[PDB]
UniProtKB/Swiss-Prot annotation, chain B:
It is found in: Host cytoplasm; Host Golgi apparatus; Host nucleus. Residues 2-303 form the Peptidase C30 domain. Changing residue 91 to R: In strain: Beta/B.1.351. The lineage of its organism: Viruses, Riboviria, Orthornavirae, Pisuviricota, Pisoniviricetes. It catalyses: TSAVLQ-|-SGFRK-NH2 and SGVTFQ-|-GKFKK the two peptides corresponding to the two self-cleavage sites of the SARS 3C-like proteinase are the two most reactive peptide substrates. The enzyme exhibits a strong preference for substrates containing Gln at P1 position and Leu at P2 position. Residues 2-303 are cytoplasmic. 3CL-PRO exists as monomer and homodimer. Only the homodimer shows catalytic activity. Interacts with host FBXO22; this interaction promotes the proteasomal degradation of nsp5. This is 3C-like proteinase nsp5. Changing residue 190 to A: Does not affect ability to cleave and inactivate human TRMT1. The active site is at 42 (for 3cl-pro activity), 146 (nucleophile). It comes from Severe acute respiratory syndrome coronavirus 2.
Length: 300, 303
């Protein structure tokens, strides 16, 4: 079988806390002696339409921030703002702090989300950064400050902090330096994203995953050039495939004995002819939120 | 595009219980709770024992000092051993300080749970599985994954419901509860075993229809009702599972949230089965989903 798999979330769970300012509560990430959270925690309903964050923050004091790790209050002893993230210095270090880094991910890359409410972890699932810099998440009221991450060996690479939902039901947020992915702004307004596209390299990775699991009805005897494939891909609002993507797909190509451009010809046929009512790995749609690495990590 | 997705429970409380158990060169995963480690009993088998193992005889030949239990690289001393159905229980000299509040539960077909896939006692990934009506799961398990567990978390309490033992020829997976009783008719022997023909999980399809209604997608509701028995007889003709009383009860919260009586929703589903969807969609799809339970729907709709 082959399904969406998230990283084990324990190393991140040990970092989640609750942050309250006024009548607003959301989550924070407690690493060493600093708690990171969305800066919109400081806004009232009046502030949120056009918040002058520097002006709002200078009017706050350390004691206006209530931070709770379970049934224990952490005293804030300083604060600062970096882009759209607030950094609350506390007087206590988190002994559960994992080895970690902050990274900014590229569109098409995947990560695990630990959805949290009131500082308590509630669910974990895999997401991709969409080409239009939204994420198709599952986030409800109170989920802000939930984070996205990848794990490599013992090191947690944090790449996402949650801030908002758009009218279409997708989500937007920042890296851990507080810079948004995409053209979004932390104000209380209805915001549209640019047109999304499908992550072609990931669809191909998943077609290879299907073949590995014995699904091969969509294969064909034909091939395509890279440029001819890309012309069709663009027509169907799929991202271009680069030579780097072809290279990245090498190990899957070698495992299955199917050249990348041969799989591209299969995908072209699927775009032009549809799935004829069949499914691939149980799905009626082409899946684009597995990277080549995700397929390899899982299949071996 | 439906707004719903498979969501696992946070795995940290289970990560803190995973160990490795080795007998000879065979290593699998175990679950360390208080001063007991639970694992599949086939750890005591050699390749040759596996076709027709005599587990009672194999266990009598073992002693405490034949079991290597490790949390990471740190050995945990075994002070007793016993077999309960298809699980081995190793008493150890240290109570796991990370033991959560826990219970052992035996789930019903249709129920979902989170799997923490582990190798050599180290977790690799977490994902949601549904117990199919034929008592198999569609996991992602490789060599070395045995002893990985399935669980749900309710408030503080981890309910362990699955321990992994084997892969069937069709690529689906079989295992036990934490008392070592297999789900389904399967046995822990390296023989060819077949799953029964699978069926659609009706209670979960009904949960999905309720989810659609909650989201304002309700074209399929009709003015009619059915008895439970009439519905079940029709359902079987479409390879859908019959509903049990427990299924009716677990749909209670969604029925109350929407005001649509369970048997009225059954009549709507019956019409969909008999007439098809006629080019229409529900929650964006022409296919009905059967791996979200009523609990999963409430979690994703209401938090
Ligand atoms: C933080 O916990 C929270 C998370 C979202 C709540 C629901 N799901 C989420 O992901 N974030 C916020 O409340 C945002 C704070 C802003 C950035 C200061 N706002 C937000 O996400 O707003 C979402 C709502 C629902 C969809 C939508 O378009 N929208 C914006 C408001 C503004 C206009 C009035 C009502 C709608 C349009
Ligand atoms: C424990 O880690 C391991 C997990 C499985 C390995 C492959 N994927 C898994 O999930 N379980 C076992 O090794 C089982 C031990 C038995 C229960 C004593 N055996 C097992 O899972 O066997 C799977 C293999 C591969 C697919 C298949 O059909 N099969 C069974 C054997 C038995 C007969 C010989 C060859 C086939 C038929």
């Amino acid at each position: 079988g082959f399904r969406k798999m998230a990283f084990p979330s324990g190393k991140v769970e040990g970092c989640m806390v609750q942050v309250t300012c006024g009548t607003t509560t959301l989550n924070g990430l407690w690493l060493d002696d600093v708690v990171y959270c969305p800066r919109h925690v400081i806004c009232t309903s009046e502030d949120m339409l056009n918040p002058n964050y520097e002006d709002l923050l200078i009017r706050k004091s350390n004691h206006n921030f209530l931070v709770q790790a379970g049934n224990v209050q952490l005293r804030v002893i300083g604060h600062s703002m970096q882009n759209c993230v607030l950094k609350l210095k506390v007087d206590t270090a988190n002994p559960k702090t994992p080895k970690y880094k902050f990274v900014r991910i590229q569109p098409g890359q995947t990560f695990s989300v630990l959805a949290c409410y009131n500082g308590s972890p509630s669910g974990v699932y895999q997401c991709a950064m969409r080409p239009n810099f939204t994420i198709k998440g599952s986030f409800l009221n109170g989920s802000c400050g939930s984070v996205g991450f990848n794990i490599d060996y013992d090191c947690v690479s944090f790449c996402y902090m949650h801030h908002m939902e758009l009218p279409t039901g997708v989500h937007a947020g920042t890296d851990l330096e507080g810079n948004f992915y995409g053209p979004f702004v932390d104000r209380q307004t209805a915001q549209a994203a640019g047109t999304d596209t499908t992550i072609t390299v990931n669809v191909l990775a998943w077609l290879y995953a299907a073949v590995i699991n014995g699904d091969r009805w969509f294969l064909n005897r034909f091939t395509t050039t890279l440029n001819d494939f890309n012309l069709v891909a663009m027509k169907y609002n799929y991202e271009p495939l680069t030579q780097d993507h072809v290279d990245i797909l090498g190990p899957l190509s070698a495992q299955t004995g199917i050249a990348v451009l041969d799989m591209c010809a299969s995908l072209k046929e699927l775009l032009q002819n549809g799935m004829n009512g069949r499914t691939i790995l149980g799905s009626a749609l082409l899946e684009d939120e597995f990277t080549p690495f995700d397929v390899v990590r899982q299949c071996s």
